[PDB]
Amino acid sequence: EVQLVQSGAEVKKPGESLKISCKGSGYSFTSYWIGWVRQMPGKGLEWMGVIYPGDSYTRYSPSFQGQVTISADKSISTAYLQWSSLKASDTAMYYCARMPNWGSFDYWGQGTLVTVSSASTKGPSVFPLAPGGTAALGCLVKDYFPEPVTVSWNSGALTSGVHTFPAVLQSSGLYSLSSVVTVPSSSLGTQTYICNVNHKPSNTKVDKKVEPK
């Protein structure tokens, strides 16, 4: 019954201000601390700071002091984490968590994804990755923003041998990803292979038939 519900995904530009929230329920909000934890893409956990909502006592870890503001509104069981001026290096997943007086994080929020970038919403360009015993084919899903993209093969009918790779951030500030499938070499004449690429932020739904050549 204890729960921490965080605010929605944030896509921001550098220099913009930002305030994210964490609402508690199922327990006495003013009897526990609220911690804020940052997890940068592909990185470990970082303790940012804590607040006791009961009296607004706030403590920041040395690397986070003066970089971020932690606050609470106990009348609505909400704690906040804010930046006066975002940087691309602020791109991370941010968790709030409940902390009893003994210092561990017993209950966590679902997390809020914060993406900070100069870039604008851009749909991907889908290119074919054209083909012992096993043939590999795929689709290159290049130059999109923001994440995520979903990829399926043959409208979900092809699932075995499928690998959709984690996207990679190019120097351009655009994401790039590949999706591949392993097929028996004998099936390259009898079978049609289509990758279905979807990038919801730009309303792009593209079907690309991947032919050998």
């Binding site: 561990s104 994080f105 017993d106 209950y107 290119f127 795929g138 290159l140 790779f165 591949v180």
Partner: protein, 210 residues
Amino acid sequence: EVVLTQSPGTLSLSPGERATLSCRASQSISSSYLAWYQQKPGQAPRLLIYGASSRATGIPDRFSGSGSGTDFTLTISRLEPEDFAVYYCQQYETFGQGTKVEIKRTVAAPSVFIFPPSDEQLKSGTASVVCLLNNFYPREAKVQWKVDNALQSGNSQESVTEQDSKDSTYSLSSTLTLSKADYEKHKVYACEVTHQGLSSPVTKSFNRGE
């Protein structure tokens, strides 16, 4: 401030085996404040142990915490498939760097594929050459790009899938990015692969316009 060093960075074990995770503090700390968390990809961390030895609510008894002073240990008596995740130790305002508990399986050499840039892409002015390393174990793999007879640097980006939930292998994709003009002034495009599963390194290549 206090530094928590976790060892090893990666623990490769089989389901049913015992796992011993180490968390070492840069100075003597109170055992009353040492916590362990578990985290699976795409999920929030979850508290396992607090006060060095206390399991959190609903944590199964196969998990146990111990140690004092500078040495702390997390033991998983008999690894279940759900225990393969990342583990962090924590004290005050500090976290350890994490230990990944990975499935150890039979060595599997990669199947290697190279893909030329499509003609559709070339019209745009960029060439993306892609190398596929499929279904291998362990994860340690080296990909070397070669344009004619010159080993490439700083023009490739790499990405690895999560350990397969069916066969316990990894797959890796590497992309070599060139301008149309750079791509067009060269012939041989190679992807040389090194891995424990292979007796000698494997090369897959293509000649531009063939």
